[PDB]
Coordinates of C-alpha atoms and ligand atoms in Angstrom, one line a residue:
Chain A
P46 CA 0.0 0.0 0.0
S47 CA 1.9 3.1 -1.4
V48 CA 0.6 6.6 -2.0
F49 CA 1.6 9.2 -4.6
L50 CA 0.5 12.8 -4.6
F51 CA 0.7 14.7 -7.9
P52 CA 0.6 18.5 -8.4
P53 CA -1.7 20.3 -10.9
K54 CA -0.7 20.9 -14.5
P55 CA 1.5 24.0 -14.5
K56 CA -0.7 25.7 -17.2
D57 CA -3.8 25.1 -15.1
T58 CA -2.2 27.1 -12.2
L59 CA -1.3 30.1 -14.3
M60 CA -4.6 30.8 -16.1
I61 CA -7.4 32.0 -13.8
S62 CA -10.0 30.5 -16.2
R63 CA -8.7 26.9 -15.4
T64 CA -9.3 24.5 -12.6
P65 CA -6.0 23.2 -11.0
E66 CA -6.4 20.1 -8.9
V67 CA -4.1 17.8 -6.8
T68 CA -4.3 14.1 -7.3
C69 CA -3.8 11.5 -4.6
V70 CA -3.2 7.9 -5.9
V71 CA -3.2 4.8 -3.8
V72 CA -1.8 1.6 -5.3
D73 CA -1.1 -1.9 -3.9
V74 CA -4.4 -2.0 -2.0
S75 CA -5.3 -5.5 -0.8
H76 CA -8.1 -7.7 -1.9
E77 CA -8.5 -8.9 1.7
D78 CA -8.6 -5.3 3.0
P79 CA -9.7 -3.1 0.1
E80 CA -11.4 -0.3 2.2
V81 CA -9.6 3.0 2.0
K82 CA -10.5 6.5 3.4
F83 CA -8.9 9.7 2.3
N84 CA -8.6 12.8 4.5
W85 CA -7.5 16.1 3.0
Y86 CA -6.0 19.2 4.7
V87 CA -5.1 22.6 3.5
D88 CA -2.4 24.1 5.7
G89 CA -3.5 21.5 8.3
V90 CA -7.2 22.5 8.2
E91 CA -9.4 19.5 7.1
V92 CA -11.4 20.2 4.0
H93 CA -14.2 18.0 2.6
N94 CA -14.7 18.9 -1.1
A95 CA -12.5 16.2 -2.6
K96 CA -13.9 13.8 -5.2
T97 CA -12.9 10.1 -4.7
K98 CA -13.2 7.8 -7.7
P99 CA -14.4 4.2 -7.5
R100 CA -11.8 1.5 -6.9
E101 CA -10.3 -0.2 -9.9
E102 CA -8.8 -3.7 -9.8
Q103 CA -5.4 -4.0 -11.4
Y104 CA -4.0 -7.0 -13.4
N105 CA -1.6 -7.8 -10.5
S106 CA -4.4 -8.6 -8.1
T107 CA -4.3 -5.2 -6.4
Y108 CA -6.7 -2.2 -6.3
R109 CA -5.9 1.4 -7.3
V110 CA -8.0 4.2 -5.9
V111 CA -7.8 8.0 -6.7
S112 CA -9.0 11.1 -5.0
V113 CA -9.0 14.6 -6.7
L114 CA -9.0 17.8 -4.7
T115 CA -9.5 21.1 -6.6
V116 CA -7.2 23.9 -5.5
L117 CA -7.9 27.6 -5.7
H118 CA -5.7 29.6 -8.2
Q119 CA -4.6 32.0 -5.4
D120 CA -4.2 29.3 -2.7
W121 CA -1.7 27.4 -4.9
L122 CA 0.3 30.5 -5.9
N123 CA 0.3 31.7 -2.3
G124 CA 2.0 28.4 -1.3
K125 CA -0.7 26.7 0.6
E126 CA 0.2 23.1 1.5
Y127 CA -2.0 20.2 0.6
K128 CA -1.9 17.0 2.6
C129 CA -3.4 13.6 1.6
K130 CA -3.9 11.0 4.4
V131 CA -4.7 7.4 3.4
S132 CA -6.0 5.0 6.0
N133 CA -6.3 1.2 5.6
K134 CA -6.6 -1.7 8.0
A135 CA -3.5 -3.3 6.6
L136 CA -1.3 -0.4 7.6
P137 CA 0.2 0.0 11.1
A138 CA -0.5 3.7 10.7
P139 CA -2.0 6.0 8.0
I140 CA 0.1 7.2 5.2
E141 CA 0.5 11.0 4.8
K142 CA 1.8 12.9 1.8
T143 CA 2.1 16.7 1.4
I144 CA 2.6 18.8 -1.7
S145 CA 2.8 22.5 -2.5
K146 CA 3.9 24.8 -5.3
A147 CA 7.6 24.9 -5.7
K148 CA 9.1 27.1 -3.0
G149 CA 11.5 30.0 -3.1
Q150 CA 11.5 33.8 -3.8
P151 CA 9.9 34.3 -7.2
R152 CA 11.9 35.9 -10.0
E153 CA 10.4 37.4 -13.2
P154 CA 11.7 36.1 -16.5
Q155 CA 13.1 38.4 -19.1
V156 CA 12.0 37.3 -22.6
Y157 CA 14.2 38.0 -25.7
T158 CA 13.6 37.1 -29.3
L159 CA 16.5 36.4 -31.6
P160 CA 16.3 36.4 -35.4
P161 CA 18.0 33.7 -37.6
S162 CA 21.8 33.7 -37.8
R163 CA 23.2 35.2 -40.9
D164 CA 24.6 31.9 -41.9
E165 CA 21.2 30.2 -41.6
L166 CA 19.5 32.4 -44.2
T167 CA 21.0 30.1 -46.8
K168 CA 18.7 27.2 -45.9
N169 CA 15.0 26.8 -46.9
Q170 CA 13.8 27.0 -43.3
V171 CA 15.1 29.2 -40.6
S172 CA 15.1 29.1 -36.7
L173 CA 13.4 31.8 -34.7
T174 CA 14.7 31.8 -31.1
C175 CA 13.1 32.9 -27.9
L176 CA 15.4 33.2 -24.9
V177 CA 13.6 33.2 -21.5
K178 CA 16.0 33.9 -18.6
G179 CA 16.1 34.8 -15.0
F180 CA 12.9 33.0 -13.8
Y181 CA 12.1 31.3 -10.6
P182 CA 10.6 28.8 -9.9
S183 CA 11.1 26.6 -13.0
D184 CA 7.4 26.0 -13.8
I185 CA 6.8 27.7 -17.1
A186 CA 4.9 27.4 -20.4
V187 CA 6.0 28.7 -23.8
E188 CA 4.1 28.8 -27.1
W189 CA 4.3 30.7 -30.4
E190 CA 1.7 32.5 -32.5
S191 CA 1.4 34.6 -35.7
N192 CA -1.6 36.6 -37.0
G193 CA -3.9 35.3 -34.2
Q194 CA -3.1 31.6 -35.0
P195 CA -0.7 29.2 -33.2
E196 CA 2.6 28.4 -34.8
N197 CA 3.2 24.8 -33.6
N198 CA 6.4 23.9 -35.5
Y199 CA 8.5 24.6 -32.4
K200 CA 10.5 22.8 -29.7
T201 CA 11.5 24.2 -26.3
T202 CA 14.4 23.1 -24.1
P203 CA 13.8 22.1 -20.4
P204 CA 14.6 24.8 -17.9
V205 CA 18.3 24.9 -17.1
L206 CA 19.6 26.0 -13.7
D207 CA 21.7 29.2 -14.3
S208 CA 24.6 30.2 -12.2
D209 CA 22.7 32.8 -10.1
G210 CA 20.1 30.2 -9.0
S211 CA 17.5 31.4 -11.5
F212 CA 16.5 29.3 -14.6
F213 CA 16.6 29.9 -18.3
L214 CA 15.5 28.1 -21.5
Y215 CA 15.3 28.6 -25.2
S216 CA 12.4 27.9 -27.6
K217 CA 13.1 27.3 -31.3
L218 CA 10.4 28.0 -33.9
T219 CA 11.2 26.7 -37.4
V220 CA 9.5 28.7 -40.3
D221 CA 10.0 28.8 -44.1
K222 CA 12.5 31.4 -45.0
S223 CA 9.9 32.8 -47.4
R224 CA 7.6 33.7 -44.5
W225 CA 10.5 35.3 -42.6
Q226 CA 11.4 37.4 -45.6
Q227 CA 7.7 38.2 -46.4
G228 CA 7.8 40.1 -43.1
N229 CA 5.3 38.2 -40.9
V230 CA 5.2 38.9 -37.2
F231 CA 6.0 36.0 -34.9
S232 CA 5.4 36.1 -31.2
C233 CA 6.9 34.2 -28.3
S234 CA 4.2 33.8 -25.6
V235 CA 5.3 33.0 -22.0
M236 CA 3.4 32.1 -18.9
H237 CA 5.1 32.2 -15.5
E238 CA 3.8 33.0 -12.0
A239 CA 6.0 36.1 -11.7
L240 CA 4.8 37.9 -14.8
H241 CA 2.0 40.5 -14.6
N242 CA -1.2 38.4 -14.9
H243 CA 1.3 35.4 -15.3
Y244 CA 1.7 36.3 -19.0
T245 CA 3.9 38.2 -21.4
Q246 CA 4.4 38.3 -25.2
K247 CA 7.4 39.3 -27.3
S248 CA 7.5 39.7 -31.1
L249 CA 10.0 39.0 -33.8
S250 CA 10.1 40.4 -37.4
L251 CA 12.6 41.1 -40.2
Chain B
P46 CA 24.5 -10.0 -7.6
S47 CA 23.8 -7.3 -10.3
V48 CA 25.9 -5.9 -13.1
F49 CA 26.1 -2.5 -14.6
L50 CA 28.1 -1.6 -17.8
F51 CA 29.0 2.1 -18.3
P52 CA 30.1 3.7 -21.6
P53 CA 33.2 6.0 -21.9
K54 CA 33.0 9.7 -21.2
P55 CA 31.7 11.3 -24.5
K56 CA 34.7 13.7 -24.7
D57 CA 37.1 10.8 -24.4
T58 CA 35.6 9.3 -27.5
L59 CA 35.9 12.4 -29.7
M60 CA 39.6 13.3 -29.1
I61 CA 42.1 10.9 -30.5
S62 CA 44.5 12.0 -27.8
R63 CA 42.3 10.5 -25.0
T64 CA 41.8 7.0 -23.8
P65 CA 38.1 5.9 -23.7
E66 CA 37.2 3.0 -21.6
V67 CA 34.1 0.9 -20.7
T68 CA 33.5 0.1 -17.0
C69 CA 31.8 -3.1 -15.8
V70 CA 30.6 -2.9 -12.2
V71 CA 29.4 -5.8 -10.1
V72 CA 27.5 -5.1 -6.8
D73 CA 25.8 -7.3 -4.2
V74 CA 28.6 -9.9 -4.3
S75 CA 28.4 -12.3 -1.4
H76 CA 30.7 -12.7 1.5
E77 CA 30.0 -16.5 1.3
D78 CA 30.8 -16.6 -2.4
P79 CA 32.9 -13.5 -3.2
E80 CA 34.9 -15.0 -6.1
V81 CA 34.1 -13.2 -9.5
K82 CA 35.6 -13.7 -12.9
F83 CA 35.1 -11.3 -15.9
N84 CA 35.2 -12.2 -19.5
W85 CA 35.2 -9.5 -22.2
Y86 CA 34.3 -9.7 -25.8
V87 CA 34.5 -7.3 -28.7
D88 CA 32.0 -8.2 -31.4
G89 CA 31.9 -11.6 -29.8
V90 CA 35.6 -12.2 -29.9
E91 CA 37.1 -12.6 -26.5
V92 CA 39.8 -10.1 -25.5
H93 CA 42.2 -10.2 -22.6
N94 CA 43.5 -6.7 -22.0
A95 CA 41.0 -5.6 -19.3
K96 CA 42.1 -4.4 -15.9
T97 CA 40.2 -5.7 -12.9
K98 CA 40.4 -3.8 -9.6
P99 CA 40.6 -5.5 -6.2
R100 CA 37.3 -6.2 -4.5
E101 CA 36.0 -3.6 -2.0
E102 CA 33.7 -4.4 0.9
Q103 CA 30.7 -2.2 1.2
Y104 CA 28.9 -1.0 4.3
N105 CA 25.9 -3.3 3.7
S106 CA 28.0 -6.5 4.0
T107 CA 28.4 -6.9 0.2
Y108 CA 31.4 -6.6 -2.1
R109 CA 31.8 -4.4 -5.2
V110 CA 34.2 -5.3 -8.0
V111 CA 35.1 -3.3 -11.1
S112 CA 36.8 -4.2 -14.4
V113 CA 38.0 -1.6 -16.9
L114 CA 38.4 -2.3 -20.6
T115 CA 40.1 0.3 -22.8
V116 CA 38.4 0.8 -26.2
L117 CA 40.0 2.1 -29.4
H118 CA 38.9 5.4 -30.7
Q119 CA 38.0 3.9 -34.1
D120 CA 36.4 0.8 -32.7
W121 CA 34.0 2.8 -30.6
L122 CA 33.0 5.2 -33.4
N123 CA 32.6 2.3 -35.8
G124 CA 30.0 0.7 -33.5
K125 CA 31.9 -2.3 -32.1
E126 CA 29.9 -4.0 -29.3
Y127 CA 31.5 -4.6 -25.9
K128 CA 30.2 -7.5 -23.8
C129 CA 31.0 -8.0 -20.1
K130 CA 30.2 -11.4 -18.7
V131 CA 30.3 -11.9 -14.9
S132 CA 30.5 -15.4 -13.3
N133 CA 29.9 -16.3 -9.7
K134 CA 29.0 -19.5 -7.9
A135 CA 25.8 -17.9 -6.4
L136 CA 24.3 -17.4 -9.9
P137 CA 22.4 -20.1 -11.8
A138 CA 24.1 -18.7 -14.9
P139 CA 26.6 -15.9 -15.7
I140 CA 25.3 -12.4 -16.2
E141 CA 26.0 -10.8 -19.5
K142 CA 25.8 -7.1 -20.4
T143 CA 26.5 -5.5 -23.8
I144 CA 27.1 -1.8 -24.7
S145 CA 28.0 0.2 -27.8
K146 CA 28.1 3.7 -29.0
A147 CA 24.5 5.1 -29.6
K148 CA 23.3 3.6 -32.9
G149 CA 21.8 5.3 -35.9
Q150 CA 22.8 7.1 -39.1
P151 CA 25.1 10.0 -38.1
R152 CA 24.1 13.6 -38.9
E153 CA 26.4 16.6 -38.8
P154 CA 25.5 19.6 -36.6
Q155 CA 25.1 23.0 -38.0
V156 CA 26.6 25.6 -35.5
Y157 CA 25.1 29.1 -35.5
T158 CA 26.1 32.0 -33.2
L159 CA 23.5 34.6 -32.2
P160 CA 24.4 38.1 -30.7
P161 CA 22.5 39.6 -27.8
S162 CA 19.0 40.7 -28.4
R163 CA 18.6 44.5 -28.9
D164 CA 16.5 44.7 -25.7
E165 CA 19.3 43.0 -23.6
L166 CA 21.9 45.7 -24.4
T167 CA 20.3 47.7 -21.6
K168 CA 21.7 45.3 -19.0
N169 CA 25.2 45.2 -17.5
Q170 CA 25.8 41.7 -18.8
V171 CA 24.6 40.2 -22.1
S172 CA 23.9 36.7 -23.4
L173 CA 25.9 35.2 -26.3
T174 CA 24.1 32.3 -27.9
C175 CA 25.3 29.3 -29.8
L176 CA 22.6 27.2 -31.6
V177 CA 23.7 23.7 -32.5
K178 CA 21.1 21.8 -34.6
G179 CA 20.6 18.8 -36.8
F180 CA 23.0 16.4 -35.0
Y181 CA 22.8 12.7 -34.5
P182 CA 23.4 10.9 -32.2
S183 CA 23.0 13.2 -29.1
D184 CA 26.5 12.8 -27.6
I185 CA 28.1 16.2 -27.9
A186 CA 30.4 18.6 -26.1
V187 CA 30.2 22.4 -26.2
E188 CA 32.6 25.0 -24.7
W189 CA 33.5 28.7 -25.3
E190 CA 36.8 30.5 -25.7
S191 CA 38.2 34.0 -26.4
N192 CA 41.7 35.1 -27.2
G193 CA 43.1 31.6 -26.6
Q194 CA 41.6 31.2 -23.2
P195 CA 38.4 29.5 -22.0
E196 CA 35.3 31.5 -21.3
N197 CA 33.7 29.4 -18.6
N198 CA 30.7 31.6 -17.5
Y199 CA 28.3 29.6 -19.7
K200 CA 25.5 27.1 -19.4
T201 CA 24.3 24.6 -22.1
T202 CA 20.9 23.0 -22.4
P203 CA 20.6 19.2 -22.8
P204 CA 20.1 17.9 -26.3
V205 CA 16.4 18.2 -27.3
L206 CA 14.8 15.8 -29.8
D207 CA 13.8 17.8 -32.9
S208 CA 10.8 16.9 -35.1
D209 CA 13.0 15.5 -37.9
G210 CA 14.6 13.0 -35.5
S211 CA 17.8 15.0 -35.1
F212 CA 18.8 16.8 -31.9
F213 CA 19.5 20.5 -31.1
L214 CA 20.7 22.5 -28.2
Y215 CA 21.6 26.0 -27.2
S216 CA 24.6 27.2 -25.1
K217 CA 24.4 30.6 -23.4
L218 CA 27.6 32.5 -22.6
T219 CA 27.2 35.6 -20.3
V220 CA 29.8 38.4 -20.7
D221 CA 30.1 42.0 -19.5
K222 CA 28.4 44.3 -22.0
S223 CA 31.7 46.2 -22.0
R224 CA 33.6 43.3 -23.4
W225 CA 31.0 42.8 -26.1
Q226 CA 31.1 46.5 -27.1
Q227 CA 34.9 46.5 -26.9
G228 CA 34.8 44.1 -29.8
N229 CA 36.3 40.9 -28.4
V230 CA 35.9 37.7 -30.4
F231 CA 34.1 34.9 -28.7
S232 CA 34.0 31.4 -30.1
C233 CA 31.5 28.5 -29.7
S234 CA 33.6 25.3 -29.9
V235 CA 31.7 22.0 -30.7
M236 CA 32.7 18.3 -30.6
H237 CA 30.6 15.7 -32.2
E238 CA 31.4 12.5 -34.1
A239 CA 29.9 13.7 -37.4
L240 CA 32.1 16.8 -37.7
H241 CA 35.4 16.7 -39.6
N242 CA 37.9 15.5 -37.0
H243 CA 34.9 15.6 -34.7
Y244 CA 35.4 19.3 -34.1
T245 CA 34.2 22.7 -35.3
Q246 CA 34.4 26.3 -34.1
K247 CA 32.2 29.3 -34.8
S248 CA 32.9 32.9 -33.9
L249 CA 30.8 35.8 -32.7
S250 CA 31.6 39.6 -32.6
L251 CA 30.0 43.0 -32.7
Ligands
LIG1 C1 0.4 -3.4 -9.5 O1 0.0 -2.6 -10.6 C2 -0.2 -1.2 -10.2 C3 -0.8 -0.5 -11.4 O2 0.1 -0.2 -12.4 C4 0.5 -1.2 -13.4 O3 0.6 0.0 -14.1 C5 1.1 -0.2 -15.5 C6 2.6 -0.3 -15.5 C7 0.4 -1.3 -16.2 O4 1.1 -1.6 -17.4 C8 0.2 -2.6 -15.4 O5 1.5 -3.3 -15.3 C9 -0.3 -2.3 -14.0 O6 -1.7 -1.9 -14.1 C10 1.2 -0.6 -9.9 O7 1.0 0.7 -9.5 C11 2.2 1.5 -9.8 O8 3.1 1.5 -8.7 C12 4.3 2.2 -8.9 C13 5.1 2.1 -7.6 O9 5.4 0.8 -7.4 C14 4.0 3.7 -9.3 O10 5.3 4.3 -9.6 C15 5.3 5.7 -9.3 O11 5.0 6.4 -10.5 C16 5.1 7.8 -10.4 C17 4.7 8.4 -11.7 O12 3.3 8.2 -11.9 C18 2.9 8.9 -13.1 O13 3.5 8.4 -14.2 C19 3.2 7.0 -14.6 C20 4.0 6.7 -15.9 O14 5.4 7.2 -15.7 C21 1.7 6.8 -14.8 O15 1.4 5.4 -15.0 C22 0.9 7.4 -13.6 O16 -0.5 7.3 -13.8 C23 1.3 8.8 -13.2 O17 0.8 9.6 -14.3 C24 0.6 10.9 -13.8 O18 -0.6 10.9 -12.9 C25 -0.9 12.1 -12.3 C26 -2.1 11.9 -11.5 O19 -3.2 11.4 -12.2 C27 -1.2 13.2 -13.4 O20 -1.4 14.4 -12.8 C28 -2.7 15.0 -13.2 O21 -2.7 15.1 -14.6 C29 -4.0 15.7 -15.1 C30 -3.8 15.6 -16.6 O22 -3.5 14.3 -17.0 C31 -4.1 17.1 -14.6 O23 -3.1 18.0 -15.1 C32 -4.2 17.1 -13.0 O24 -4.3 18.4 -12.6 C33 -2.9 16.4 -12.5 O25 -3.1 16.3 -11.0 C34 -0.1 13.3 -14.4 O26 -0.4 14.1 -15.5 C35 0.3 11.9 -14.9 N1 1.5 12.0 -15.8 C36 1.6 11.3 -16.9 C37 2.9 11.5 -17.7 O27 0.7 10.5 -17.4 C38 6.5 8.2 -10.0 O28 6.6 9.6 -9.7 C39 6.9 7.5 -8.7 O29 8.3 7.8 -8.3 C40 8.9 7.8 -7.0 O30 9.5 6.6 -7.1 C41 10.8 6.4 -6.5 C42 10.5 6.5 -5.0 O31 10.2 5.2 -4.5 C43 11.8 7.5 -7.0 O32 12.3 7.1 -8.3 C44 11.1 8.9 -7.1 O33 11.3 9.7 -5.9 C45 9.7 8.9 -7.6 O34 9.2 10.2 -7.2 C46 6.8 6.0 -8.8 O35 7.7 5.6 -9.8 C47 3.1 3.8 -10.5 O36 2.7 5.1 -10.8 C48 1.8 2.9 -10.2 N2 1.0 2.9 -11.4 C49 -0.2 3.6 -11.5 C50 -0.9 3.4 -12.8 O37 -0.6 4.2 -10.6 C51 1.8 -1.5 -8.7 O38 3.1 -1.0 -8.4 C52 1.8 -2.9 -9.1 N3 2.3 -3.7 -7.9 C53 3.3 -4.6 -8.0 C54 3.6 -5.3 -6.8 O39 3.8 -4.9 -9.1
LIG2 C1 24.9 -2.3 -1.1 O1 25.8 -1.1 -1.4 C2 26.2 -1.1 -2.8 C3 27.2 0.0 -2.9 O2 26.6 1.3 -3.0 C4 26.1 2.0 -1.8 O3 26.4 3.1 -2.6 C5 26.2 4.4 -2.0 C6 24.7 4.7 -2.1 C7 26.7 4.5 -0.6 O4 26.1 5.7 0.0 C8 26.3 3.3 0.3 O5 25.0 3.3 0.7 C9 26.7 2.0 -0.4 O6 28.1 1.9 -0.5 C10 25.0 -0.9 -3.6 O7 25.4 -0.8 -5.0 C11 24.5 0.0 -5.8 O8 23.5 -0.8 -6.4 C12 22.6 -0.1 -7.2 C13 21.5 -1.1 -7.7 O9 20.8 -1.7 -6.6 C14 23.3 0.7 -8.3 O10 22.3 1.5 -9.0 C15 22.5 1.7 -10.4 O11 23.2 2.9 -10.5 C16 23.5 3.3 -11.9 C17 24.2 4.6 -11.9 O12 25.5 4.3 -11.3 C18 26.3 5.5 -11.5 O13 25.8 6.6 -10.7 C19 25.8 6.4 -9.3 C20 25.2 7.7 -8.7 O14 24.0 8.0 -9.4 C21 27.2 6.1 -8.8 O15 27.2 5.8 -7.4 C22 27.9 5.0 -9.6 O16 29.3 4.8 -9.1 C23 27.8 5.2 -11.1 O17 28.7 6.3 -11.3 C24 29.2 6.2 -12.7 O18 30.1 5.1 -12.7 C25 30.7 4.9 -14.0 C26 31.6 3.7 -13.9 O19 32.6 4.0 -13.0 C27 31.4 6.2 -14.6 O20 31.8 5.9 -15.9 C28 33.2 6.1 -16.1 O21 33.5 7.4 -15.6 C29 34.9 7.8 -15.8 C30 35.0 9.2 -15.1 O22 34.4 9.2 -13.8 C31 35.4 7.7 -17.2 O23 34.6 8.7 -18.0 C32 35.1 6.3 -17.7 O24 35.5 6.3 -19.1 C33 33.6 5.9 -17.5 O25 33.5 4.5 -18.0 C34 30.5 7.4 -14.5 O26 31.2 8.6 -14.8 C35 29.9 7.5 -13.1 N1 28.9 8.6 -13.1 C36 28.8 9.5 -12.0 C37 27.8 10.6 -12.2 O27 29.5 9.4 -11.0 C38 22.1 3.4 -12.6 O28 22.4 3.6 -14.0 C39 21.3 2.1 -12.5 O29 20.1 2.2 -13.2 C40 19.3 1.1 -13.7 O30 18.4 1.0 -12.7 C41 17.1 0.7 -13.0 C42 17.0 -0.7 -13.6 O31 16.9 -1.6 -12.5 C43 16.5 1.8 -14.0 O32 16.1 2.9 -13.3 C44 17.4 2.2 -15.2 O33 17.3 1.3 -16.3 C45 18.9 2.3 -14.7 O34 19.7 2.2 -15.9 C46 21.2 1.7 -11.1 O35 20.3 2.7 -10.5 C47 24.4 1.5 -7.8 O36 25.1 2.1 -8.8 C48 25.3 0.7 -6.9 N2 26.3 1.6 -6.3 C49 27.6 1.6 -6.6 C50 28.5 2.6 -5.9 O37 28.1 0.8 -7.5 C51 24.0 -2.1 -3.4 O38 22.8 -1.9 -4.2 C52 23.7 -2.2 -1.9 N3 22.8 -3.4 -1.7 C53 21.7 -3.3 -1.0 C54 20.9 -4.6 -0.9 O39 21.3 -2.3 -0.5
LIG3 ZN1 -15.3 14.9 4.7
LIG4 ZN1 4.8 21.8 5.7
LIG5 ZN1 -3.2 34.9 -10.7
LIG6 ZN1 42.0 -13.4 -20.3
LIG7 ZN1 24.5 -7.1 -30.5
LIG8 ZN1 38.3 10.1 -35.1

């Protein structure tokens, strides 16, 4: 009987319109003692609005049971701590797990767009680069757009720990050299808790 | 009794002056049966030049024993396969492990240097960017230099799998804006099997 507690999707925590939730998973629940109760606490205060899912038997003759607690946008960003306690007759004592947003003084990213290198304008496609640096904590989302439509031919590196303790990354959008030279506007779009409204946008053009 | 087989350091495989080696580690060797023999094979042909280290007792009442086989620069790059076989009276059968250089058609990186973004020239330090794209396999080394001396105030992202099946990364070197504007030459230095002599260099200046 082991317990895992998973945080919300990072994007769900950064957009007020979404519903972040924390997920408490119990595995290796017995057939002989399959009863399980969850208790949830927010900063140690018990709360009662979680949603537990019906048990599901696994192929290795164990049960798996899940409970989902919605968290408030502001509670998560303000560092509230979420505890999941799992009780079962087979355990000597209940199992407790706690989770919160990544801790530490927040730092606002600086977003910089970089045009193709001169040497790359030989090729048929060119790389449009978005540098995002100086942010803390590392939870971040990055996407690209042009003319009110997503540009999805991109890849983004994981966050990399920089020498001052902040994080940076780069996102690379690949476009036809014709579109670059035709003058279209491309935008690097960044979501991070420390931005105003957790959002900023930076453009790139010839 | 478990066996782990480790490849050479990537940089040791890319510089003919260095000595790449493969390392075969055996852990959880008994006290009651601590005798261990290694056999090594290169493409299935037994070889006899390995160097086995004396057993070392661990704090959990087990032994750990290591054998080191040197590999030739060309053998490793040409995809030869190295097998480590570990025999012990406590096993029903010997344990065999095989390792080789990462497999797949090699692809030569393109190296591009990118100067600071216009918006960053406000700050006291600026970011010099080296994009390395299109390479396969992902083993790679990246460093920076200026005026025949290393510039070590840099960070490099891990390789990221690109949508064509090749890899890319970015390396970010941070320098005083004064040095950038004084006109110094900075060089992104890249080692990868698919380059000529597994080496190339690209420069960056105002
Ligand atoms: C008997 O079987 C059960 C059932 O599982 C088997 O499952 C697979 C393999 C099948 O093929 C069959 O063989 C079986 O049915 C076994 O249960 C497993 O026990 C493992 C421990 O022994 C446990 O390992 C731990 O996994 C953690 C990762 O879990 C992730 O990722 C795995 C895949 O990598 C995935 O299977 C899980 O479902 C889970 O996926 C995430 O789930 C969360 C919660 O739902 C998601 O979060 C939500 O996402 C939504 C959107 O999707 C939304 O954003 C919500 O807001 C958000 O909350 C999240 O998105 C999911 N991610 C993905 C990518 O899907 C590890 O973290 C953990 O690691 C710790 O382990 C070590 C410490 O001991 C350390 O290395 C380290 O510290 C790690 O932190 C464990 O590895 C398995 O997860 C668990 N399987 C399941 C399905 O629960 C059981 O073990 C077996 N018993 C025996 C005796 O064999
Ligand atoms: C009893 O104790 C022993 C001894 O260890 C204890 O060790 C530590 C923890 C102490 O604090 C004490 O508690 C004990 O003394 C236990 O032995 C351990 O068993 C583990 C398995 O149960 C095994 O795990 C496997 O580790 C692999 C990684 O090994 C790396 O990294 C670890 C740290 O992460 C490091 O400790 C190892 O030494 C090894 O380090 C690399 O070694 C290679 C070879 O030397 C280096 O390569 C060479 O490098 C040089 C330059 O340095 C040169 O370039 C050469 O050319 C090159 O060949 C390499 O540089 C080293 N790297 C670093 C960063 O140092 C994992 O890969 C492996 O993973 C597989 O595991 C799973 C599959 O089952 C999967 O997740 C996955 O597929 C993984 O691939 C395992 O996790 C430990 O390594 C092993 N410890 C040692 C020291 O050998 C024993 O278990 C314990 N028994 C019991 C019952 O408790
Ligand atoms: Zn309740
Ligand atoms: Zn706490
Ligand atoms: Zn908010
Ligand atoms: Zn021999
Ligand atoms: Zn083979
Ligand atoms: Zn060579």
